[PDB]
Amino acid sequence: PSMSITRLFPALLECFGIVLCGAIAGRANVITSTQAKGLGNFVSRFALPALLFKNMVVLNFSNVDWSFLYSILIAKASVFFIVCVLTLLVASPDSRFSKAGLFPIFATQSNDFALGYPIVEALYQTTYPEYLQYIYLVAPISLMMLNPIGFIFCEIQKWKDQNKIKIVGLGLNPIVFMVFIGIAFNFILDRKVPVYVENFLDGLGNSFSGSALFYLGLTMVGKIKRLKKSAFVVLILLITAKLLVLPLLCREMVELLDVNHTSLSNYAFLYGVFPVAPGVAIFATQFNMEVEIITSGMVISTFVSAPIMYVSAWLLTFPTMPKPLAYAIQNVSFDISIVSLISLIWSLAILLLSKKYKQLPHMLTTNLLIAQSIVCAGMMIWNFGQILVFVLLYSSLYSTYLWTGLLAISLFLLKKISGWGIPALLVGVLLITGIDSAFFYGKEQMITTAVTLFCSILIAGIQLTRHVLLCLLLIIGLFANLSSCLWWLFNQGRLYVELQFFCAVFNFGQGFISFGI
Amino acid sequence: PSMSITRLFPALLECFGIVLCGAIAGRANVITSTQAKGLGNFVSRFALPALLFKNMVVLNFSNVDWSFLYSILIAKASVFFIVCVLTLLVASPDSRFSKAGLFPIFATQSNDFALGYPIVEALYQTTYPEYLQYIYLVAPISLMMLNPIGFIFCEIQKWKDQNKIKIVGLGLNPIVFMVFIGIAFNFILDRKVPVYVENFLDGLGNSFSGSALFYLGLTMVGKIKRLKKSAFVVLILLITAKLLVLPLLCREMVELLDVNHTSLSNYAFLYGVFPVAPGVAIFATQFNMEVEIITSGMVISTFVSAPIMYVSAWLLTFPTMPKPLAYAIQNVSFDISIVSLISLIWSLAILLLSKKYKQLPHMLTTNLLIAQSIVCAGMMIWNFGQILVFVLLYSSLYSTYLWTGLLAISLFLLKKISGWGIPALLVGVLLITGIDSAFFYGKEQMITTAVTLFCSILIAGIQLTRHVLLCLLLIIGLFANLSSCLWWLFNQGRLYVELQFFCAVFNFGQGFISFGI
C-alpha cells in the first residue's frame, strides 16, 4: 500500500491522544486562561509562521504537479458553488448571502497541519514525499482564491446592515502573509535557510502540531449547543457534503484531470475528509455570526472525521491486496476492538456510578456493556487451548445478541432470569462437541451465530427510551451482520469484504453507540 | 544639445497656457463645481490609470539602467533623511513626527506627468527616448518605498491622538495599484496591447496631461494664505531644498554611481527641479494637516519652478556650445522679453485701472513700467536703419535706469521734470554721432550704459513703500549688471557668460518684479 495503514492506526491514536489531552486539560482547568491565551499567541504568532516559512522555503518547486493541485482547487471551488447556490435557493434573502458565505467556507477548509499532515506524512514519509508538499500547496491557494468570495459575500451582509468602499475594500490572516512571504524569500534565496535562524525555526515550528491540537482541545470544551430544531439537520448536511461528497468530487475531478494515479486519487479522497479548520472558526467570531452552529461543526467535524478517515483509509486499500484481506480485517477489528475497550471501560464506570442496576432496561443495558467488554477483552487475546479460551469470548460475542433480544423483550414490556440464562451456553456446547471468530471451525460457527443473531432481530421485530433508541441503533447492525451471515453461508466478489468490514465495525463499535446511550 | 532647448521654451509655454487657462477657468467660474468634480473623476479614476497601464505595458524592460534609477531613488531617500532629522531637531515633539512626515514627502514628490514628461519628452523625443521610461520608473518606486515612511510617521501622530494595529496596519492610491498591476500584465502579455482596448486606452490616456494641468489650475485658486510669521520662511526652505538642493544631490549621486552621462547628470538635475505633485496635496487633505502651507507650497512650487527649470535648462547647456553662446543668450533674452511683455501689458493695464498717476512714486512706477514695455516691444524687433529704429529701444533701455534713479530720488523725498528729461537722450546722440544691445558698436555702448546704470545705483545709494521695495529689488539687478559692464569693459572664462544670462533675466524680467509690485 502507498499509505502505511499499519502506521495509520498508530499515527491516528497519537494525534487523538494529544487532542483529547487538550480537551481534558480544558475541562479540568489544569491550564489557566492566561497561559491558555499565552499558548494561543505562541502558536498563532510564533510557531505557525515559523513552520510556514520553514517548510515553504524548504518546499521544492522543481516539480509542481499542476494537475493534482488545480484539480483539488477547482473541486473545492465547485463545492463552494453548489453549496452557495443551493443555500441561496433555500435560505431567506436576509440570511441567504450570510448563509452562502460562512456555510461554504465552513464546508471547504481542512485543518491540514492539525491531523492530516501528521497522518498523511506517517502514511507517506517514504513512499510519496510529494504529498507532504501538496498539503501546503493546496490550503494556501484555497485561502487566497476562495475565502475572498465568502468574505465579500458577508460584506454584502454588512451592506444590508459601496463596492470599492467595503465590498472589495474590506473583502481582501498571518497564514497568507507569511505564506506568500515565504515564496518571496524562496525566490530570493536558493530555497535554502541559514543555520542561525534555521535552528530556531526548527525548534519552534516542530513544536506546533501537538500544541495546535492542544489549543484545539482547549477550544472544544463547552462548544456544542442543542440545535436540533433546524440546525443539526443542516449541520450534518454540511458535514456529509464536506466529508464524503467533497472527497468524492475530488476523486472524480482528479480522474478527469490527472496505479500511482489511483493511489493519488485515493489521496484525493484522503483529502477533503479532513475535519474543518479553525480559520473559519475565527472568521465567524470576527463576523460574530451564529458561532454555535459553527463551533458545533468544529466539534463533530473531528468527532466523526476521525472514524471516517480511519474506515475510509482501510476501505480504499482492500481492492489492492484475499489472504491480506483477512489479515487487514483482522487487524482493523483488533484495533477498533482496543479503542472499543476504551469506550467499554468508560461505559461500565459511568453506569455503575449512576446506579443503572435499576429494574428498568438500564440494568439490562449494563449487561450489554459488560458483555461487549468481555468481547473486547477477548479481542486482546487475538494477536499475541488458546482457542479453548476463545470459546468463552465467542460465547460472550453471542451474548451481546441474546442480551439485546431480551432487552427488546423488556422494551416490549415497557409498552405492555433469561438474562443470565444465555442459550449461547448451548452454542458453546455445539462449539466444543459438535484465525477469526467466523473461522472458528468449518461453516457451523457462523451458522450457530446466523441463527442466534436472527432470534434477537426477530425478538426485536416482536433514560429507558434512550435505551430503546440504543436497541434500535444496534439492531441496525443486527441486520447488517445478518446480511453477512446469510451471504457467506449461501455463497462463500469485492462485495462480501466491505460488509465484513461493516459487521466488524458494528460487532466491534456498538460499544460506542451504547457509549453515547 | 541632448535636450531641445529650441523646443524647451515652446513646450514650456504650451503647458503654461493650459495651466493658466485652468487657473482662469477656476477664477471666472466658467466651469461649474459639478463638472469640475466630474473632470476630476475623469482624470483620476479613468485617464490616469489608462496612461499608467498603457505606457507601462509599452514600457520596455530590455534595458533598465539600474545605475540612474537607483541613484535617483537613493538621492530622494537621502533628501527624506536629512530633512526629517533636521525638522525633528528643530520642530516640537508634538508636531515633530507630523513635521518629519508630510514635510519630507512634500519636498520629494515631482508631478512628473504634469509638466516634466511633456517638457523632457519635447526635449528628448528623438535624442534619448529612454528618459521617457525613466520618468515612470522613478516616481512609482518612490511612492512604493518612501511614502510609507512619512505615512507611518503620521500614524505615530494618530498614536499621539499599536504597531501592527495602525502604525503598519494602516501605514501601507490608484497609482501604485494600477502601476504594479501594469507590471503583472506586462509579464503576462509580451509587452503588447490588444487593439480592442488599445484604441480606448490611447484615446483616454492621451487626453490626461492637459486635463491634469486644467484640474491643477482648478486647484490653484484661493489656496495661498498669509503665512509670513514662521511658515513662508520654512516654506521657501522646503522649496529650495526640493528645487535646487535635491537636484544637486541627484547630480552628485549620479556622478558617484553612474559626455552622455554628463547630459544624463544634467537630466539628473533636470529631475527634482519639478514642482511638487498633488499626491501629497491630497495626502495632507486625508490627514487634514495644515493644508494652507502645503497648498501654498503647491502654488509657489509651479510658480517658481517654471522660471527655474527654464533658466537652469539654459544654464546647463552653455558649457556645451562662443558664437552659439551669443545666439543662446540672444534667444533666451528674446523669449523672456516676450513673456516680459505679457507681464508688462498686464502691469500697465492694472496701473491705469488703479489710477496710479498719483503724485506719489506710483506715477514714477507707471513710467518705469511703460519704459520696460518699450524695452520689450523693441525686443520683438530683434529676430525678424533696422538699428536706427533700435536706437529708440536702447534709449528706452537706458530709460529704465534713469527713471528708477529719479524714483530713488522720489523715495528719498518720502523720507525728507527730470522724469521726461531723459539724459539718455544725450546717450542716443552719442550712439548716432560718436547683434545685441551690448554689440551696438565697439565698446562705447556698454561704456555709456556702464556710466548711466551706475548714476542710478549711486542715486539709489544716496503702496509707496511697496514701490520702495520694488526699487530695492531692481537695484539688486543694477548691481548685477554693473558687475557685467565693469567686467567686460575691464577684460573682454565660463564666468562672464552666466552673468550675461543673469543681467539678461534681470534687465529682461524686472517687469515681473514690478508685476508683483
Supply the DSSP string of B327-370, one letter for each residue: HHHHHHHHHHHHHHHHHHHHHHHHHHHTTTTSTTHHHHHHHHHH
Q: How many CA atoms lie within 13 A of A363 on its CB side?
A: 8
Sort residue B271 into left (φ over 0), alpha (ψ -120 to 50) or beta. Answer: beta
Question: Which CA distances in Å does A251 have to A145, A331, A399, A463, B158?
Answer: 21, 26, 42, 43, 53
- Amino acid identity of residue B206, one-letter, is N
**In angstroms, rounded to a whole number, what is the distance separating the alpha carbons of residues B110 and B135?**
10
Closest CA to B154 of B241, B95, B239: B95
Indicate the length of chain A as a whole number. 517
**HSE-up (13 A, CA, CB side) for residue A256:** 10
How many Å apart are CA A452 and CA A507, to the nearest integer? 14
| DSSP 3-state of B2 | coil
In SS3 terms, B360-374 reads as CHHHHHHHHHHHHHH
Angle between helices B361-379 and B464-490 (to 10 degrees): 40
SS3 for B309?
helix
Give which of B209, B90, B78, B203 is closest to B149, Cα–Cα.
B78
> Of B217, B218, B238, B216, which Cα lies nearest the Cα of B227?
B238
Question: DSSP letter string over B144-192?
Answer: HHTHHHHHHHHHHHHHH--IIIIITTTT--HHHHHHHHHHHHHHHTTS-
Name the 3-class secondary structure at A493.
coil
User: CA A153, CA A81: separation in Å to the nearest integer?
Assistant: 12
For residue A277, the SS3 value is coil
Q: Which three cell numbers stand for residue B9?
A: 521654451
Closest C-alpha among A111, A124, A130, A110 to residue A8: A124
In sequence order, the 6+-apart residues with CB closer than 8 A to the CB of A87 are A96, A99, A100, A103, A104
Q: Which amino acid is at B444?
A: E
Dist CA B254 CA B69 (whole Å): 9
Write the secondary structure of A423-461 as one string of H (helix), E (strand) and C (coil): CHHHHHHHHHHCCCCCCCCCCCHHHHHHHHHHHHHHHHH
How many Cα atoms occupy the beta-carbon half-sphere of A170 within 13 Å? Answer: 14
B453 class by beta-carbon count within 10 Å (0-12 exposed, 13-18 middle, 19+ buried): buried
Measure the CA–CA gap between A105 and A107, rounded to whole angstroms: 5
Alpha-carbon distance of A377 to A362, in angstroms, equals: 22
Question: Counting Cβ atoms within 10 Å, is residue A144 exposed (0-12), middle (13-18) or buried (19+)?
Answer: middle
- How far apart, in whole angstroms, are the C-alpha atoms of residue A380 and residue A345? 14
B176-214 in b/e form (b: 16+ CB < 10 A) is eebbeebbeebeeeeeebeeeeeeebeebbebbbbbbbb
Output the DSSP codes for B114-146.
IIIHHHHHHHHSSS-TTHHHHHHHHHHHHHHHT
A495: number of Cβ within 10 Å? 8
Q: Which of A335, A431, A409 is nearest to A379 (CA)?
A: A335
* Reported CATH class of domain B5-316: mainly alpha
Cell of A1: 500500500
Q: How far, CA to CA in Å, does B132 sit from each of A83, A389, B119, B141?
A: 52, 94, 10, 15
C-alpha grid cell, residue B127: 535624442
Query: In A42-146, where does DSSP find H-type helix?
Result: 48-58, 66-90, 93-99, 102-106, 117-124, 131-145
| One-letter amino acid of B26 | G
Q: Using an 8 Å Cβ cutoff, are B312 and B273 in contact?
A: yes
* CA-wise closest residue to A108 among A151, A60, A65, A75: A75
H/E element holding B379? helix B361-379
3-class SS of residue A208: coil
Render the burial of B24-33: b for 16+ CB within 10 Å, e for the rest. Answer: ebbeeeebee
**CA pair distance B428, B404, nearest whole angstrom:** 19
A421-A425-A426 Cα angle (round to 5): 115
Closest CA to A292 of A229, A383, A240: A229
Q: Quick check: A239 and A75 in contact, CB under 8 A?
A: no
For chain B, the structural domain boundaries read 5-316, 323-516
Alpha-carbon span A104 to A78, nearest angstrom? 10
A486 vs A428, A499, B176, B321, B399, CA distance in Å? 21, 12, 74, 111, 130
Distance CA A130, CA A260 (A): 12
Q: Across the strands, what pairs with B110?
A: B276
Count Cβ neighbours within 10 Å for each residue of B338-377 and write b for 16 or more, e otherwise. Answer: ebbbbbbeebeeebeeeebeeeebbbbbbbbbbbbbbbbb
Distances in Å between the alpha carbon of A290 and those of A282, A287, A295? 12, 9, 9
Report the Cα A315 to chain-centroid distance in Å. Answer: 14
Measured CA distances, B478 to B426, B431, B453, B454 (Å): 21, 22, 7, 8
User: SS3 for A294-354, per residue?
Assistant: HHHHHHHHHHHHHHHHHHHHHHCCHHHCCHHHHHHHHHHHHHHHHHHHHHHHHHHHHHHHC
Phi, psi (rounded to 5 degrees) for B207: -100, 35
Answer whether B269's CB lies under 8 Å from B250's CB. Answer: yes
Residues B396 and B437 sit within 8 Å (Cβ to Cβ): no
Q: Is B208 helix (H, G, I), strand (E, B) or coil?
A: coil
What gap in Å lies between CA B73 and CA A292, rounded to an integer? 54
CA atoms within 13 A on the CB side of A21: 11
Q: What are phi and psi of B234, to 5 degrees?
A: -70, -30
Question: Which of B185, B190, B296, B156 shows the shortest CA–CA distance to B233?
Answer: B296
Q: Which residues have a Cβ under 8 Å from the Cβ of A444 and sit 6 or more positions away?
A: A430, A434
Experimental method for this entry? cryo-EM
Q: CA angle at residue B155 from B151 to B161, to 5 degrees?
A: 145
- Backbone φ, ψ for residue B276 (5° rounding): -65, 150
For residues A284 and A94, what is the distance between their CA atoms, to the nearest angstrom? 17
Buried/exposed A253-285: b ≥16 CB within 10 Å, e otherwise? bbeeebeeeebbbbbbbbbbbbbbbbbbbebbe
CA B475 to chain centre: 23
For residue A81, which of A295, A246, A282 has the smallest C-alpha distance? A246
Crossing angle of helices A131-145/A48-58, nearest 10°?
A: 120
| Resolution for this PDB entry, in angstroms | 4.5
DSSP for B399-460 reads HHHHHHHHHHHHHHHHT--HHHH-THHHHHHHHHH---STTSSTTTHHHHHHHHHHHHHHHH
In which residue are the cell numbers 497561559 written?
A35
Bridge partners, residue A110, by sequence: A276
DSSP annotation of A275 reads P
d(CA A204, CA B43): 51
* CA pseudo-torsion sign A466, A472, A473, A475: positive
C-alpha cell at A103: 456555510
Residues just before a chain gap in chain B (C–N exceeding 2.5 Å) are 161, 172, 258, 321, 384, 416, 434, 462, 492
Given 1.10.287.1080, 3.40.1010.10, 1.20.1070.10, 3.40.50.300, which CATH number is that of A323-516? 1.20.1070.10
| Grid coordinates of A25 | 486539560
Pairwise CA distance, residues B36 & A24, whole Å: 68
Residue owning grid cell 487657462 = B21
User: Which cell is A493 given?
Assistant: 466478489
Residues 6+ away with beta carbon under 8 Å from A396:
A371, A374, A375, A378
Instruction: Give the H/E segment covering residue B392.
Output: helix B390-414
Distance CA(A197)–CA(A469), nearest Å, equals 58
A32 burial type by CB count under 10 A (0-12 exposed, 13-18 middle, 19+ buried)? exposed
Distance CA B349, CA B114 (A): 31
For residue B147, CA distances in Å to A35, A508, B271 come to 40, 67, 18
Q: Identify the three-state secondary structure at position B251.
A: helix
Residue pair A221/A27 in contact by the 8 Å Cβ criterion: yes
The whole-angstrom separation of Cα B60 and Cα B47 is: 21
Give the count of beta carbons closer than 10 Å to the beta carbon of residue B93: 9
Q: Across-strand partners of B276? A: B110
| Contact (Cβ atoms closer than 8 angstroms) between residue A208 and residue A18 | no
Where on the phi/psi map is residue B4: left (φ > 0), alpha (ψ -120 to 50), or beta? beta
Q: How far is CA A280 from CA A54, A292, A500, in A?
A: 24, 13, 38
